[PDB]
Symmetry: C3
Subunit: 211 residues, 3 copies
């Protein structure tokens, strides 16, 4: 499991959550890790290197096979009830990525606020791919092998179709987004976890989205 | 190799077939598994959970690293001489997936008849993403990392270009399908297995496709 | 470094190069492998199976988790200072692939000169998909999960956007290529390795590009 090299690191992993086969490494200082009850954070590899990094995983989060790299002054926030399969999250350039509550992220997700390397214009020598924060709203379903790139904001209750690559933000909630270039392909929907709930009304979790 | 609980489950695996490192699990009633002669089903993980499930794999089929999950009243059918590398096939909502004769599936395929999770309309709360059968015709070649989703029928003698996602059926045979979105990019062709042949006429297996 | 079986194979790997966790397998005759100075080739699996194959890796190349398959009469050449993460290179049909200087290849690349199986036109029965050499120019950055197919030539100082598949060659240098089909999406650029420079003028390696 754990491996630290530094001082004033705060690691509070709630007592009920499980972290089987997970490696957590914190190199650096004034960092904080927080995992709530009753999380399942399994077969993952999480690296914090730097200072003043924040990793916050709320209650009731299940993650399996996450590779996570966090650099100095970055923060990853994952809200309650979010489930995640295999995937990768990279944060750099002192940015932030937030993932709202009750998300379902299917295997193969790649999420990042950065390209990790600079691209400059020959026209004026300036950098033009500065990193940008990623906001993934509440009740977002990412299908298989979805890629969410820097600065993309995803509204609440959105489904992203399998193998879709997102470069830009969308504003409309309750919609499905797929294709290349990524596009709204269906409007006025709500997804759920259980095919055994036959209408949206039979899923206690959904009441809010049709209010 | 296999574990099986329940009633009137029939498991017929020819003694001339190899199943090295494959796990087959059958839990339920009235399920049927057939694997024919001179097959090589290796390093695979195959699960049937439910009632009245049918798995049928014909002669001379070679599969390597298939992960396959079938739920009750579901069926998978793979006809003779088809070859498959690593990949995933998933069937739910009591549907069916068919793979025809002499198909060639490269490493990384994802095939399914279901989204695994419901999407409902905000207008009337009804489910709008019900599962739908998948039919992959005879002599279909799927390039690397191809995804075949619900409802998709693929005609005979078709090549699907690597990393292509199919959301919809096609009707034209003898073509190459590729891109995003998936479109016919070459017409009037026939594919074969062996690069050493000079022409299609040199490959007896191809007679039926050009007459 | 080697599990070398056959006749008249030459393997010259500089004593200053690290090969930790790497399987190099050479099965066949008259194959030659050159790896230059100060390379780091680790956790890779490089198989030369066949005869008369050449692998040439120049100085200061760094490779982590390459799965490489070469067949008879094929050639792979990787020029100085190139870096590669996990990925796959497949060469067949007696063809070649060449990667230029100071390229940066991110996790998930797939580079091939061959479809590995024939496609014939019904008009005349002839094969229409013969393998074709791949050329990646100098100072090309392949983003994550990029696929480069047969016959593709990439010009100097190009960035390929993540998840893009190239079926065709480009001619314009200094550009970003993305989408499907692959298109030039931004012209007149230059990329660098380290993002601690407000402008390109603080990267000495970039001077040759303006």
């Amino acid at each position: 499991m754990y491996s630290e090299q530094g001082i004033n690191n705060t690691i509070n992993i709630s007592t009920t959550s499980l972290t089987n086969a997970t490696q957590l490494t914190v190199i650096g200082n004034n960092n904080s890790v927080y995992i709530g009850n009753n999380c399942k954070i399994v077969s993952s590899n999480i690296r914090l290197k730097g200072n003043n990094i924040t990793l916050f995983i709320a209650d009731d989060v299940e993650i399996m096979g996450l590779v996570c790299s966090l650099h100095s002054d970055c923060s990853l926030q994952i809200q309650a009830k979010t489930t995640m399969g295999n995937g990768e999250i990279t944060i750099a350039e002192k940015g932030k990525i937030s993932i709202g509550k009750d998300c379902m992220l299917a295997h193969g997700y790649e999420i990042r606020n950065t390209d990790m390397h600079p691209i400059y214009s020959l026209e004026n020598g300036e950098r033009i791919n500065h990193g940008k924060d990623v906001i993934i709203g509440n009740h977002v379903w990412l299908g298989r092998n979805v890629t969410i790139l820097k600065g993309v904001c995803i509204p609440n209750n959105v489904v992203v179709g399998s193998h879709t690559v997102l470069y830009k933000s969308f504003k409309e909630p309750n919609c499905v987004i797929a294709g290349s270039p990524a596009k709204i392909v269906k409007e006025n929907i709500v997804w759920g976890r259980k095919m055994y709930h036959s209408t949206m009304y039979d899923d206690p979790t959904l009441n809010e989205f049709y209010k």
